[PDB]
Design a protein around this ligand. Structure first.
Ligand SMILES: O=C1Nc2ccccc2C1=O
Ligand SMILES: [Cl-]
Length: 163
């Protein structure tokens, strides 16, 4: 229950976050995969024990006392725009329920479905706006992690535009 709930963005490996829990951009089978999920597998391998969860869902597995929230955004290559948008909205909502359940003051979160699950489309505002819609009713400090300076720039732009 953080005192003045904020949004920030950082450009670095989420595996090196300074928050009380991490959201893994997970695949539905609980496999190490690539991208966020790979660095995450290296840092918190124990968290992948029974981490498999359906598209549009989030499952928490504790590494000791450190929660890893496995959130499965849809692969837009496999879904329609409409159904993909529904599953992506749902995954973020499930992240919010988990963050609330875990009582944490802060969460590190990537933009779900913006990398190899994007179906070769820019889904920054789509993914970010679904993140906001889900996390705006929580009181955790939210720190969004990205790899690209132009993604970093536009995310902050979008955060600042609400303040
Ligand atoms: O946040 C980000 N999502 C991305 C997807 C593809 C390439 C770069 C990025 C980012 O920096
Ligand atoms: Cl992705």
């Amino acid at each position: 229950g953080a005192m003045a709930p904020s949004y920030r963005v950082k450009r670095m490996d989420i595996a090196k976050n300074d928050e009380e829990c991490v959201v893994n951009a997970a695949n539905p089978r609980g496999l190490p995969g690539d991208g966020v999920c790979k660095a995450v597998y290296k840092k918190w391998p124990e968290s992948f024990k029974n981490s498999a969860t359906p598209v549009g869902t989030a499952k928490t597995v504790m590494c000791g006392t450190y929660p890893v929230i496995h959130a499965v955004g849809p692969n837009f290559s496999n879904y329609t725009e409409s159904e993909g948008d529904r599953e992506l909205a749902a995954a973020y909502r499930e992240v919010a329920k988990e963050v609330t359940r875990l009582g944490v003051n802060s969460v590190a979160i990537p933009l779900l479905s913006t990398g190899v699950y994007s179906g070769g489309k820019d889904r920054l505002t789509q993914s970010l706006n679904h993140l906001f819609t889900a996390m705006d009713s929580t009181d955790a400090d939210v720190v969004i992690y990205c790899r690209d300076k132009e993604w970093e720039k536009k995310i902050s732009e979008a955060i600042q535009m609400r303040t």
